[PDB]
Description:
The PDB classes it as chaperone. The first copy, chain A, has 214 residues and is an alpha+beta fold. Chain A has helices at 10-21, 29-51, 86-95, 100-110, 187-197, and strands at residues 5-7, 64-69, 74-79, 131-139, 146-150, 155-160, 170-177, 205-212.
Amino acid sequence: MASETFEFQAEITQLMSLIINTVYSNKEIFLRELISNASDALDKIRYKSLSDPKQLETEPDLFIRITPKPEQKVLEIRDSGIGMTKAELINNLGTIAKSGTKAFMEALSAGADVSMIGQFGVGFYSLFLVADRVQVISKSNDDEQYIWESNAGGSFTVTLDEVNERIGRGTILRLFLKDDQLEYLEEKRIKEVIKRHSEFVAYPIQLVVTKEVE
Amino acid sequence: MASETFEFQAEITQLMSLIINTVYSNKEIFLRELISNASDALDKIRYKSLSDPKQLETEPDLFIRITPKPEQKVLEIRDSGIGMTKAELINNLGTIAKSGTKAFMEALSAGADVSMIGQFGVGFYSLFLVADRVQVISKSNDDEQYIWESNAGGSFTVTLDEVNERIGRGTILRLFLKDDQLEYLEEKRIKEVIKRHSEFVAYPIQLVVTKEVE
Ligand SMILES: C[C@@H]1C[C@H]2O[C@@H]2/C=C\C=C\C(=O)Cc2c(Cl)c(O)cc(O)c2C(=O)O1
Ligand SMILES: C[C@@H]1C[C@H]2O[C@@H]2/C=C\C=C\C(=O)Cc2c(Cl)c(O)cc(O)c2C(=O)O1
């Protein structure tokens, strides 16, 4: 109840406009970047749990889950990783500069391939290749569940979560797919994209598929 | 935020103890009864929509969805039917007598088969054959989302929903399966049970299955 608006650090706004507007051919790379963030987030909690085992109690199962929601033309990528607090969502996703933000844009301009985005540490923004709106729902052991939302505009919002399912711990990336990128809602397409660019992932990757009983 | 307790009409409490304690052999009948309630609830909104089309706008897709959640040993049966208001959950699920409640118990005592429960209009309670706890999450166009919860005790609770996913319209029956009835979480078992006792259902029945990418 009651949002909170924040301005995006100027360069992040540029990058976003760039990503969401590049005619780029190979938009499927966004899944690789998101699954990668999910994996690192899971490494984080695993490592932290080394000296603080109780930390995994909020969600003992470590996994990455992709859930397509046709009716709402939404694609969700979830992980039971370390999660983010209200402060971290604000920091990590928009108000703090980000080292490679400008460097990547400069590299892109020089001819670099969009797929290099992840090497600049800003792969998250690659989601705008297939979605024009996103909701990052997170729950860290250190805070409540919050929704961070953006549509590539110069500003984003953070609202305490009182509308989504409770996630024990972790993050959900709710991607509102563009009208021409609804192929990522299909199991085959998803399955194949995950196969080629994500072969060495330490955690199970679950695909949630809704099938009408024969 | 803030529950509200209510006592169960005495006979419903009896029936529940009976169901949750009957050694009965054919516990799988609960799915047939629940899918049946789901169907009737969908008929209700379809019919009402005949003269009030805007009523389907909250959720244009009419369906029944079964979603097993292993980690939490939970089984969910959802429908985008008419849904129930706070008042209706209280009325329909516990505080109002219910014509066949006593008649069915008398019939059972005479030797009747538990599967007749649905003919007495109290099939919902058959869920206690496989679950020792249940949450009925509902959203009617006429109210907010609420959670009705019970564990066959003499009382139940109703809380405004600020923790579950938003359902456009309809009801979710979250069944917390008993430790020895976890077979209903399996796709095959579910698939076969649905096949035998639910052949003439007017709406699509979707099974949500989580598969780890090969
Ligand atoms: C802050 C934590 C943990 C970090 O060390 C991990 C690696 C990358 C983080 C990138 C982010 O900016 C946030 C993020 C994104 Cl974008 C995502 O799609 C999935 C996630 O699970 C996280 C996250 O929860 O990240
Ligand atoms: C009140 C409405 C609509 C009624 O006319 C329909 C038929 C049966 C109703 C039985 C109930 O007692 C509530 C109920 C149950 Cl138990 C269920 O498992 C699923 C449902 O969708 C409803 C419901 O929403 O019911």
